[PDB]
Design a protein around this nucleic acid. Structure first.
Length: 252
DNA sequence: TAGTCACATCAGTGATCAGTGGTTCCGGAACCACTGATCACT
């Protein structure tokens, strides 16, 4: 599962650990048998394994190369939930719209998410939002568990609505109550903001019954809009399946 | 320039106990009664 990062993790771990076995064995700490007591080189693992099945809505490049590009689809949940409605606007008009949607969601006391790129601008923007009397928090590189766990307590107690993270937010958050997310400066072509990143944000925003995505960037990256288009067409497919069942998207 | 990486222990290091070395300390005037003269008499 998540072999798209497990296999790169395998090679990266082997490389870093063999760099350590250098300066360990190469520099008189253990014998080369230490170097042997290692993660299997990716090829060695690929041999020692049996039949291989990768599990991810975003198959890895080398994974697709191994599998020939074919796969097995499972995207329509039996529940009937559908993907969010995406919107794209330029970077300008971001603070005003952000506050407006903050208040609109606070009418019903709903959640919201925000992404960012640079730490300085991220925390500056969160500071301004706090200055405008906004129930907002932010995340940085090395935040610790207590902060976001008390954030979970707060959100399930209806204290705040929005959060402002950069990268690590992408992992370890399941928020059914957010019907709107904002994606800052997706225009830049970055590894951490790749098609996998946009698909992850799409899945995040798909949690709510009528979730919504809002990416604010001057230009539109190929990955972001192709991901949005495939998301919306599979969303139409899911809606068709729902209405064929005579069942509205069912929260579960 | 960067998040994950995971294959225990000599040797301090002394606390701290928890055993050993040593502590230490009172009341003494009473109590039991016993014991060398002193006139007495001879």
């Amino acid at each position: 599962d998540e072999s798209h990062v497990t296999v790169p993790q395998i090679g990266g771990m082997y490389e870093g650990d063999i760099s350590r076995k250098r300066n360990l064995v190469e520099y008189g700490f253990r014998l080369p048998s230490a170097c042997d007591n290692r993660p299997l080189t990716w090829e060695e693992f690929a041999d020692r394994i049996g039949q291989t099945v990768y599990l991810s809505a975003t198959p890895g490049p080398y994974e697709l190369s191994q599998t020939g590009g074919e796969f097995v689809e499972q995207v329509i949940r039996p529940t009937g939930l559908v993907d969010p409605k995406v919107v794209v606007k330029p970077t300008k008009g971001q603070i005003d719209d952000l506050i407006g949607e903050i208040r609109t969601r606070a009418d019903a006391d709903q959640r919201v998410l925000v992404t960012t790129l640079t730490k300085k601008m991220a925390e500056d923007l969160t500071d301004y939002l706090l200055e405008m009397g906004i129930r907002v928090r932010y995340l940085h590189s090395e935040v610790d568990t207590l902060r976001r766990v008390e954030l979970l307590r707060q959100l399930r107690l209806g204290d705040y609505d929005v959060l402002v993270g950069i990268n690590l937010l992408r992992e370890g958050l399941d928020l059914p109550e957010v019907s709107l997310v904002a994606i800052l400066d997706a225009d830049k072509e970055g590894f951490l903001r790749s098609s996998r990143s946009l698909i992850q944000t799409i899945g995040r925003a798909a949690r709510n019954v009528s979730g919504e995505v809002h990416m604010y960037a001057d230009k539109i990256t190929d990955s972001m809009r192709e991901a949005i288009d495939e998301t919306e067409r599979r969303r139409a497919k899911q809606i068709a399946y729902n209405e064929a069942n005579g069942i509205d998207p069912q929260p579960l």
